[PDB]
């Protein structure tokens, strides 16, 4: 699905994404995609937003994550879709 270089992309989160990131990690201006991806992963895991009997599906209809991504649920295996959902919440910097 994804090239390995993608995680090196330098990004500046939009306000809503930054709000979420600050609840799981230190506040800075610029992140790598690897960092954004990790913090979002930890947010999901700590808040237990996944189905216990169906661990590939994240449910976020009752969470700010749902507002960020614009979906009630998604699969952790759908990597291309996740990248698209994240990208709409940031500006790439070069
Ligand atoms: C309960 O057991 C359990 N174990 C494991 C998982 C679990 N599976 C994956 C991820 N997780 C966690 C950290 C949420 C993780 C992931 C999912 C959603 C988001 Cl926004 C962000 C991340 C970082 N990701 C993934 C997604 C992309 Cl685009 C690229 C690379 C990876 C590795 C996965 O494939 C998981 O997901 C809820 N549950
Ligand atoms: Cl929330």
């Amino acid at each position: 699905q994804i090239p390995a270089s993608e995680q090196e992309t330098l990004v500046r989160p939009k306000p809503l994404l930054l709000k979420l990131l600050k609840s799981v990690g230190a506040q800075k201006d610029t992140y790598t995609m690897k960092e954004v991806l990790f913090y979002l992963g930890q947010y999901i895991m700590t808040k237990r937003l996944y189905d216990e009997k169906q661990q590939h599906i994240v449910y976020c209809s009752n969470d700010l994550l749902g507002d960020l991504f614009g979906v009630p649920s998604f699969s952790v295996k759908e990597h291309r879709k996740i990248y698209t959902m994240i990208y709409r919440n940031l500006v790439v910097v070069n």
Side-chain angles (χ1 to χ4, degrees):
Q1 281 190 104
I2 322 295
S5 59
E6 171 53 46
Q7 279 207 310
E8 301 176 67
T9 307
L10 298 156
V11 298
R12 200 184 303 273
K14 292 174 186 181
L16 211 76
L17 180 54
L18 187 63
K19 179 175 179 60
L20 204 147
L21 292 181
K22 282 159 63 272
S23 76
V24 287
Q27 204 292 149
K28 53 177 182 160
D29 280 343
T30 302
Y31 298 81
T32 67
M33 271 306 294
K34 180 207 166 180
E35 288 164 322
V36 174
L37 214 48
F38 171 83
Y39 290 130
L40 286 173
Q42 284 296 148
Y43 177 87
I44 290 160
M45 297 306 293
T46 53
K47 289 192 83 177
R48 298 180 168 108
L49 298 179
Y50 57 88
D51 198 352
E52 182 55 46
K53 339 101 207 290
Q54 190 187 223
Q55 296 182 354
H56 295 151
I57 309 304
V58 173
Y59 289 94
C60 46
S61 58
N62 68 0
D63 197 277
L64 168 74
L65 185 59
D67 299 336
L68 212 85
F69 277 8
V71 293
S73 61
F74 65 95
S75 169
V76 295
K77 305 303 197 182
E78 294 175 312
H79 286 201
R80 194 207 52 75
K81 295 175 193 205
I82 291 168
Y83 274 110
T84 295
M85 291 184 295
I86 295 167
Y87 262 96
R88 289 172 180 159
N89 288 284
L90 52 77
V91 170
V92 176
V93 292
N94 267 293

